[PDB]
Copies of this chain bind each other. A is one copy, B any other.
Amino acid sequence: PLLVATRVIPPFVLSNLSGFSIDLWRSIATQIGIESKLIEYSSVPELISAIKDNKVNLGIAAISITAEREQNFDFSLPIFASGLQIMVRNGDIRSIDDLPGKVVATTAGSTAATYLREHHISVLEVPKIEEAYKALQTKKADAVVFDAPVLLFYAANEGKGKVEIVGSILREESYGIILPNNSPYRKPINQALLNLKENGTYQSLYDKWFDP
């Protein structure tokens, strides 16, 4: 059976195991005709090490496809469109223009953390995005920078009436299923994914988590 590394980050991955990426991988696994075990990891870099250490066959959650990651690993066709975005409390912070000199929360080992560090912005790195939302509400942080879809999902729910997404996408990124190089499952994964997109399953799955 295929060993699949995952990471908790709603609405793509939730535990109690559910979410967009979970339903998607399952539809993909069945599409191919193989069984798989989901192994949770605390962060993206940990999930990546699992790939590099050959502990799992692939990884899926809300993994950004980046040049640096593509350099040492491989990816399937994109499974979702994302991008970095700023979120503030419900001001003096309206865009990236205002970030220098502020404290911004985000998850450790994320493309957001890397982007913030490159811009020399003071960062409060937390293990789970949920803790960043708390830092913002408690005012420990002045803003949050993370993947647009995740922030929007939050604003649409728990964050309702308590936050605001400001500015434009600071960095366009798409999600993908990460794999080791020369993986024999990349093509069957892409193949299945394309089928799901061509038969209407991807759409149904999309609406379930992003279209009420």
Contacts and interface: CB of A to CB of B under 8 A. Distances in A.
Interface in A144-180: 171-172, 174
A190 interface: yes
A35 interface: no
Contacts of A71: 187, 191
Contacts of A103: 124, 135, 140
A127 B67 CA distance: 23
13 contacts: A65-B194, A67-B191, A67-B195, A70-B194, A74-B187, A75-B77, A77-B77, A108-B117, A121-B127, A122-B126, A122-B131, A171-B198, A172-B203
Interface of A: 42, 65-67, 70-71, 74-75, 77-78, 81, 103, 108-109, 113, 117, 120-127, 131, 135, 140, 171-172, 174, 187, 190-191, 194-195, 197-198, 203
Q: How many copies of this kind of chain does the complex include?
A: 3
A77 B65 CA distance: 10
Contact of A109 (B81, B117, B131, B194): B117
Nearest to A195: B67
A125 B67 CA distance: 23
Contact of A67 (B123, B135, B194): B194
Contacts of A122: 124-127, 131, 135
A67 B32 CA distance: 13
A159 B3 CA distance: 52
A137 to B, nearest CB: 14
A52 to B, nearest CB: 13
Contacts of A197: 172
Contacts of A120: 42, 108, 127
